[PDB]
């Protein structure tokens, strides 16, 4: 009865205020605007990955969307079994499948920009360390730390980045504990790249500011400024590393619907497509800080500066 897009995620939550929420929102917009339909399913454990993709393929969906590095192995296999079914992989790469499109993001380039903002706010308070909390480090996740460190060092090579890994994208309690550990050490800015877990990092920052501690958090995926309002007016969110997975999902769903699915291609959504970067409006960033950030953004887009894909501590 309708062209249908089906989303399979490893997360039990599409309202994570971040990544899964952006993907579902993009699929939802495509459906609403094109008189089509959509649905999703959660694959909590990997024993569910293959059967979940298979069921959708068995219903002859217009497009099957798989989110994240965890589902890659299952997509690689399943796409070969259903050569006529179109699949879209977000946040990972699949090769040798003419029925699969891989959407990847230049998140190292966008993270460079919030690294500049972080280093400037830290210097403002005489701090020589900033924090970074990441959900997991598999797949393309290391790009966030690589770019964040690069942006911080571009401002002041002496500022250290202190890293904490949660090893989960769905545990806010853990996010809060790791944020408390970093803030208790004297850090005043933390960039969180942790999906649902990250909501706990934002909560901890809100609680600290409420009681007079001059701390900040940088959000991810969505513009999380409102998520950080703690006293009715002010927000603890300095800025956010926005990642338009919604645009990717919506646009590729439309290509599938129209017959122009770019099967077998990896499409990079980067800083020049405005697919990653910071929000257009930033109440907590001064015009001077904004100028510095846009200056760097221009050099990255022109390739005058190339942002690494792995941080110093992860390189030989
Ligand atoms: O549930 C998830 N499954 C896989 N990856 C995720 C999930 N949530 C978040 N990310 C990854 O972490 C980054 C920051 O939130 C997201 O951009 C995405 O790359």
Q: Are residues 61 and 197 in the same domain?
A: no
- Could you tell me which residues are beta bridge partners of residue 288? none
Those residues whose C-beta lies under 8 Å from the C-beta of residue 112, and which sit 6 or more positions away, are: 147, 148, 150, 151, 154, 296, 300, 307
Please indicate, yes or no, whether residues 128 and 92 belong to a single structural domain of this protein: no
**CA proximity to 92, closest of 19, 156, 5, 170:** 19
Q: Are 191 and 93 found together in one domain?
A: no
The count of domains in the chain is 2
Gap between the Cα atoms of 211 and 206, Å rounded: 9
Residue 304 contacts by C-beta under 8 Å, 6 or more apart in sequence? none
Determination approach: X-ray
Measured CA to CA, the distance from residue 221 to residue 242 in angstroms comes to 4
* Two tokens, residue 192: 């969180």
Closest CA to 168 of 160, 178, 159, 158: 178
Lookup: tokens for 229: 């309002």
Q: 3-state SS of the chain? A: CCCEEEEEECCCCCCCCCHHHHHHHHHHHHHHHHCCEEEEEECCCCCCHHHHHHHHHHCCCCEEEEECHHHHHHHHHHHHHCCCCCEEEECCCCCCCCCEEEEEECHHHHHHHHHHHHHHHHHHCCCCEEEEEECCCCCCCHHHHHHHHHHHHHHCCCCEEEEEECCCCCCHHHHHHHHHHHHHCCCCEEEEECHHHHHHHHHHHHHHHHCCCCCEEEEEECCCCHHHECCCCCECEEEEEEECHHHHHHHHHHHHHHCCCCCCCEEEECCCCCCEECCCCCCCCCHHHHHHHHHHHHHHHCCCCCCCCCCHHHCC
Compute the half-sphere exposure of residue 154: CA atoms within 13 Å on the CB side of its CA.
26
Pick the atom of ligand 1 nearest to 141's CA: 19
Q: Are residues 233 and 157 in the same domain?
A: yes
User: Does one domain contain both 97 and 173?
Assistant: no
Chain CA centroid to CA 247, Å: 13
Judge if 48 and 158 occupy the same domain.
Answer: no
Q: Are residues 124 and 220 in the same domain?
A: yes
* Annotated binding-site residue? 19: yes
What's the CATH number where 94 sits? 3.40.50.2300
243 is in an annotated binding site: yes
Q: Do both 7 and 125 map to the same domain?
A: no
Q: Residue 140 region, left (φ>0) first, then alpha (ψ -120 to 50), else beta?
A: alpha
Angle at CA of residue 224, ends 290 and 13, nearest 5°: 150
**CA 19 to ligand 1 center in whole angstroms:** 5
Task: Note whether 223 and 112 are same-domain residues.
Answer: yes
Assess whether 115 and 127 both reside in one domain. Answer: yes
The arrangement of strands across the sheet holding 189-193 comes to: 160-165, 129-134, 189-193, 216-221, 237-243, 276-277
How far is Cα 160 from Cα 129, in angstroms, rounded to an integer?
5
Return the residue whose CA atom lies nearest to atom 1 of ligand 1: 11
Would you say the CB of residue 111 lies under 6 angstroms from ligand 1? no
* Domain membership of residue 156 as a residue range: 106-243+270-316
- Does one domain contain both 238 and 279? yes
Whether the CB of 221 sits within 6 Å of ligand 1: yes
Look at residues 22, 3, 75, 70 and name the one whose alpha carbon lies nearest to residue 269: 22
**Mutation pick for ligand 1 pocket among 12, 16, 17, 18 (CB with most ligand atoms within 8 Å):** 18
Residue 30, token pair as written in the block: 């495509």
Q: How far apart are CA 16 and CA 306, in angstroms?
A: 32
- Within 10 A of 271 (CB to CB), how many other CB atoms are there? 21
**Residue 280: which residues within 8 A CB-CB, separation 6 or more?**
none
Residues 35 and 117 in one domain: no
Q: In whole angstroms, what is the distance from residue 120 CA to residue 88 CA?
A: 38
11 is in an annotated binding site: yes
CB-CB contact of 243 with 275 (8 Å): yes
């Amino acid at each position: 009865g309708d062209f249908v897009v089906g989303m399979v995620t490893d997360s039990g939550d599409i309202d994570d205020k971040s990544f899964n929420q952006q993907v579902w929102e993009g699929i939802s917009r495509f459906a609403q605007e094109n008189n089509a339909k959509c649905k999703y399913v959660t694959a909590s454990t990997d024993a569910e990955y293959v059967p979940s993709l298979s069921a959708f393929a068995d219903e002859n969906m217009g497009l099957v969307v798989a989110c994240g590095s965890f589902l890659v192995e299952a997509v690689i296999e399943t796409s070969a079994r259903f050569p006529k079914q179109k699949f879209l992989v977000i946040d990972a790469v699949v090769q040798d499948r003419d029925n699969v499109v891989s959407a990847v993001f230049g998140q190292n380039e966008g993270s460079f920009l919030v690294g500049v903002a972080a280093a400037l706010k830290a210097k403002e308070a005489g701090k020589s360390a900033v924090g970074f909390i990441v959900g997991m480090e598999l797949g393309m996740m290391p790009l966030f730390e690589a770019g964040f460190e690069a942006g911080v060092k571009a401002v002041d090579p002496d500022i250290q980045v202190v890293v904490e890994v949660a090893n989960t994208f769905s545990d806010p309690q853990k996010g809060q504990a790791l944020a408390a550990k970093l803030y208790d050490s004297g850090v005043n800015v933390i960039f969180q790249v942790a999906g649902g877990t990250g909501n706990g990092v934002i909560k901890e920052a809100r609680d600290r500011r409420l009681n007079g501690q001059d701390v900040w958090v940088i959000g991810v995926d969505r513009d999380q400024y409102m998520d950080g309002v703690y006293d009715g007016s002010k927000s603890v969110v300095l800025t956010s590393m926005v990642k338009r997975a919604d645009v990717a999902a919506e646009r590729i769903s439309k290509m599938a619907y129209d017959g122009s699915f770019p099967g077998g291609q990896s499409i990079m959504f980067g800083l020049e497509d405005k697919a990653v970067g910071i929000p257009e409006e930033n109440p907590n960033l001064s015009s001077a800080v904004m100028e510095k950030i846009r200056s760097f953004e221009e050099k990255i887009v022109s390739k005058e500066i190339v942002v690494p894909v792995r941080s110093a501590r992860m390189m030989n």
